[PDB]
Design a protein around this ligand. Structure first.
Ligand code: HEC
Ligand code: HEC
Lengths: 108, 108
């Protein structure tokens, strides 16, 4: 594809310092600023029940794969114009590789 | 995305007349000319154990999503040059929509 596995340990801590502020990954985890991400892979965007997604998000109808997730994480607002997720991006592929490896594992 | 659900009933019969010759979809289904396709979504190409995939296939390292599957099904040889799958393609999007809807369901 254009995604290579990295370090889930490395990924665990990128999550903690970069995404925990707004999201949980555990099944049975609650929505915060962001929606709980458990079971995100293979899902299409804007389908977590109980969460209030912007219209941009839902209309993109993204099928969440490790490949999509990377482009997204680069610059979320360029990928989903009008998205309310306020994160500038993970510009180095190695960090995204590490983070998705982690996400791949924990959101299962 | 760029895939819309269709008819699984329609999809069931496209499978039977178009892909059954070489493939099974049931979990516990065996490889034939083609590999058993159960659990194909979310998988990367060339990973069924017990099957002899060409080098092209395996090196493409495709993550199988409903979106990828469509382009693939259009013209498999253009998508994976050197693939040994001998099928010309499903040129109408409506047929591919119907077939993937079916596959989505049965290969789960
Ligand atoms: C708060 C400052 C956030 C941070 C940091 C991160 N995300 Fe986020 N995310 C947030 C919101 C409010 C939303 C919903 C957006 C909307 O427009 O409705 C999102 C969305 C996502 C998504 C899309 C989910 C879907 O179910 O379709 C994903 C995949 C996602 N967030 C993941 C994610 C990751 C991995 C983060 C760290 C790299 C991250 N987000 C940061 C809020 C915030
Ligand atoms: C025999 C005449 C086939 C027909 C008709 C179809 N497929 Fe096939 N397929 C066949 C082979 C021998 C192989 C392996 C190719 C190789 O280069 O190693 C394949 C491969 C696939 C794949 C890729 C699978 C993977 O696990 O990576 C898929 C997704 C697939 N086949 C699906 C498929 C569908 C849905 C078909 C009907 C539309 C179909 N194939 C036709 C042999 C033959």
């Amino acid at each position: 594809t254009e995604f290579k596995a990295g370090s889930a340990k490395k990924g665990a801590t990128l999550f903690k310092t970069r995404c925990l502020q707004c999201h949980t990954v555990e099944k049975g985890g609650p929505h915060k600023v962001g929606p709980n991400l458990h079971g995100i892979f293979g899902a299409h965007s804007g389908q977590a029940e109980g969460y209030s997604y912007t219209d941009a998000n839902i209309k993109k109808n993204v099928l969440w794969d490790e490949n999509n997730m990377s482009e997204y994480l680069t610059n979320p607002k360029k990928y989903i114009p009008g998205t309310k997720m306020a994160s500038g991006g993970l510009k180095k592929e190695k960090d995204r590789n590490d983070l998705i490896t982690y996400l791949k594992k924990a959101a299962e």
